[PDB]
Write a protein that holds these residues in place. Structure first.
Motif, short mmCIF file in Angstrom:
data_model
loop_
_atom_site.label_atom_id
_atom_site.label_comp_id
_atom_site.label_asym_id
_atom_site.label_seq_id
_atom_site.Cartn_x
_atom_site.Cartn_y
_atom_site.Cartn_z
N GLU A 51 2.29 24.84 -39.48
CA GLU A 51 1.04 24.71 -39.30
C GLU A 51 0.55 25.91 -38.27
O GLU A 51 1.22 26.45 -37.58
CB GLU A 51 0.72 23.41 -38.40
CG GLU A 51 0.61 21.99 -39.12
CD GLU A 51 -0.63 21.79 -39.83
OE1 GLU A 51 -1.75 22.74 -39.53
OE2 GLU A 51 -0.82 20.81 -40.44
N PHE A 52 -0.79 26.56 -38.50
CA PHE A 52 -1.13 27.78 -38.09
C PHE A 52 -2.04 27.44 -37.10
O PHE A 52 -3.04 26.80 -37.39
CB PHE A 52 -1.71 28.68 -38.97
CG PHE A 52 -0.83 29.37 -40.08
CD1 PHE A 52 0.71 28.97 -39.98
CD2 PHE A 52 -1.21 30.09 -40.99
CE1 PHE A 52 1.41 29.44 -41.29
CE2 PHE A 52 -0.47 30.81 -42.01
CZ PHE A 52 1.17 30.45 -42.27
N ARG A 74 -3.97 16.90 -36.54
CA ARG A 74 -3.75 17.51 -37.88
C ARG A 74 -2.86 16.92 -38.90
O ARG A 74 -2.91 16.46 -39.89
CB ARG A 74 -3.28 19.11 -38.16
CG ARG A 74 -4.44 20.19 -37.32
CD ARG A 74 -3.73 21.46 -37.34
NE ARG A 74 -4.36 22.65 -36.80
CZ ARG A 74 -3.97 23.85 -37.12
NH1 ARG A 74 -2.98 24.05 -38.05
NH2 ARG A 74 -4.48 24.69 -36.30
N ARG A 110 -4.33 13.75 -40.04
CA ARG A 110 -5.48 13.98 -41.01
C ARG A 110 -4.91 14.16 -42.29
O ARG A 110 -5.26 13.68 -43.37
CB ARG A 110 -6.21 14.85 -40.44
CG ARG A 110 -7.22 15.52 -41.33
CD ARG A 110 -8.26 16.42 -41.01
NE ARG A 110 -9.36 16.70 -41.99
CZ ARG A 110 -10.10 17.91 -42.06
NH1 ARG A 110 -10.08 18.60 -41.17
NH2 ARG A 110 -10.84 17.82 -43.03
N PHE A 111 -3.67 14.79 -42.29
CA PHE A 111 -3.19 15.28 -43.71
C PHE A 111 -1.79 14.75 -43.96
O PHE A 111 -1.15 14.77 -44.94
CB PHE A 111 -3.08 16.98 -43.86
CG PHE A 111 -4.71 17.19 -43.69
CD1 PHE A 111 -5.58 17.22 -44.69
CD2 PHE A 111 -5.03 18.04 -42.75
CE1 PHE A 111 -7.06 17.76 -44.71
CE2 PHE A 111 -6.20 18.77 -42.52
CZ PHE A 111 -7.23 18.51 -43.59
N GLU A 123 -6.86 21.72 -44.50
CA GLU A 123 -5.55 22.12 -44.10
C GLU A 123 -5.31 23.62 -43.59
O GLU A 123 -5.77 24.45 -44.49
CB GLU A 123 -4.55 21.75 -44.93
CG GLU A 123 -3.33 21.09 -44.44
CD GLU A 123 -2.55 20.15 -45.63
OE1 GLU A 123 -3.14 19.67 -46.33
OE2 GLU A 123 -1.61 19.88 -45.26
N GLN A 124 -4.40 23.77 -42.56
CA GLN A 124 -4.39 25.07 -42.08
C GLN A 124 -2.76 25.58 -42.30
O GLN A 124 -2.24 25.78 -41.28
CB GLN A 124 -4.74 25.29 -40.56
CG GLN A 124 -6.15 24.90 -40.61
CD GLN A 124 -6.86 25.10 -39.09
OE1 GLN A 124 -6.81 26.04 -38.64
NE2 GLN A 124 -7.50 24.01 -38.57
N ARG A 125 -2.48 25.67 -43.51
CA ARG A 125 -0.83 26.02 -43.86
C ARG A 125 -1.20 26.71 -45.34
O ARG A 125 -2.07 26.68 -45.90
CB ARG A 125 0.21 24.92 -43.77
CG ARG A 125 -0.90 23.75 -44.14
CD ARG A 125 0.01 22.72 -43.19
NE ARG A 125 1.19 22.09 -43.84
CZ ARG A 125 2.15 21.15 -43.51
NH1 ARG A 125 1.61 20.35 -42.69
NH2 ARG A 125 3.08 20.83 -44.36
N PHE A 160 -9.48 29.27 -43.45
CA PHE A 160 -9.37 28.09 -43.51
C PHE A 160 -11.09 27.37 -43.43
O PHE A 160 -11.50 27.48 -42.60
CB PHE A 160 -8.38 27.48 -42.56
CG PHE A 160 -7.05 27.96 -42.67
CD1 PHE A 160 -6.31 27.86 -44.05
CD2 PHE A 160 -6.43 28.63 -41.78
CE1 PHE A 160 -5.10 28.44 -44.06
CE2 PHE A 160 -5.33 29.04 -41.73
CZ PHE A 160 -4.51 29.18 -42.96
#
Lengths: 222, 228
Positions: free
Chosen positions: A192-193, A218, A221-222, B183-185, B201
């Motif tokens: 994760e960023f 997060r 959520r995902f 999504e942040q990846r 993103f």
């Protein structure tokens, strides 16, 4: 849902300039700041922190700045001798001053039995470098009859990389840039960023707890 | 408005949100997937007009085999239709990923579209199909090992330049990565190639990502360049 955190500690120069200090005043804080972050992270149950201290591209800075950083890193390893966390270094050590090479070796050996949090310092490290040295090692083993090309898979390759599993669950970069700048390339595949404009010398307990809360949201959520 | 001189030459695209979009719209799962063809035609046209030179789009990850065989079979037929549709579309098309694991008709459709479009002169569209960042690094490593074992390589020559010659996604590397769906990846997309890429993103779902959203992303890239 607690995260291995990878940390890009950007913003030290800007922080010092905004305050009216010389450039080295922010760099200098790497020691108390990493002590502060190790203490907070142990309390939350983190496990591993990998901190990007010096990139293979950082040699292009002025000789005065590079010489200061190398002396600062020596002081860092001396200060963490009795700090109580386990310390490891990844990166090309043979290009460093000899005194720094021996300080690294001493702190790694002295702290190798310390229990709990593991602090990994990436010093003269880059993602390209890590992948290439793993490739060279694998070639050497094949040429010596120790492995088959068909055995080359993710498991074998990750054993040859310098940054080991478990890979970072969360990457935190301070200073506002939204890139990874040739840090842990292979190891960031599912990380994760989290990017924040907060400058590294200002990054404290409330900022780290916010990053962990965002990581938890997060994940749900995902 | 955009500055003409600060347009990213290579954008990498993770096309997430198709399933959630279809669910929100009251449609079946496959309805979102089907839009890859009109969506990539639309984004190719917008990008050509803005001066983008290369788009690498993540169409099928090495982990996508874990979906149901019914879903994977549908996607494989869809990809065949995609390459037939892009035979005459006018952009240069290349594919990266492990092709030998694909249905043979799809392997030959890919090969035909690559050969037919290899002389097309503008935007280069790279489709990442049965591709992953791990896969790219491992196949490059295996290629180098094979050359060394066959006597074709002096080991002292193994360096960044050699490694980049063996990787499937080539320089110039992406200046900007756009991932839709929130999504942040990077989810094992272009690992080596993303070392200096800007990450963008957006919560916008891919079927909703259009000209204004792409211009917003580019505008944001330009402002980061001014700042840093």
């Amino acid at each position: 849902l607690i995260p291995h955190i990878a940390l890009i500690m950007d913003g030290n120069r800007r922080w010092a300039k905004a305050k009216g200090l010389e450039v080295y005043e922010g760099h200098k804080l790497i020691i108390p700041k990493l002590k502060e972050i190790c203490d907070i992270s142990s309390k939350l149950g983190i496990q591993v922190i990998t901190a990007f201290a010096f990139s293979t591209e950082n040699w292009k800075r002025s000789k005065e700045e590079v010489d200061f950083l190398m002396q600062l890193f020596e002081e860092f390893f001396n200060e963490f001798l009795r700090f109580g966390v386990r310390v490891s270094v990844i990166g090309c050590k043979s290009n460093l001053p000899m005194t720094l090479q021996k300080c690294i070796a001493l702190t790694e050996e002295t702290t190798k039995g310390n229990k709990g949090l593991h602090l990994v310092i990436a010093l003269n490290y880059g993602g390209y470098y890590d992948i290439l040295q793993a490739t060279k090692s694998i070639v050497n083993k094949a040429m010596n009859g120790l492995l088959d090309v068909e055995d080359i898979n993710k498991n074998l390759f990750e054993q040859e990389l310098e940054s080991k599993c478990p890979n970072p669950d969360l990457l935190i970069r301070t200073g506002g840039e939204q890139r990874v700048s040739n840090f842990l390339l292979w190891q960031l595949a599912y990380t994760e960023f989290y990017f924040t404009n907060t400058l590294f010398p200002d990054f404290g307990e409330k900022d780290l707890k916010k990053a962990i809360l965002n990581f938890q949201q997060r994940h749900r959520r995902f």
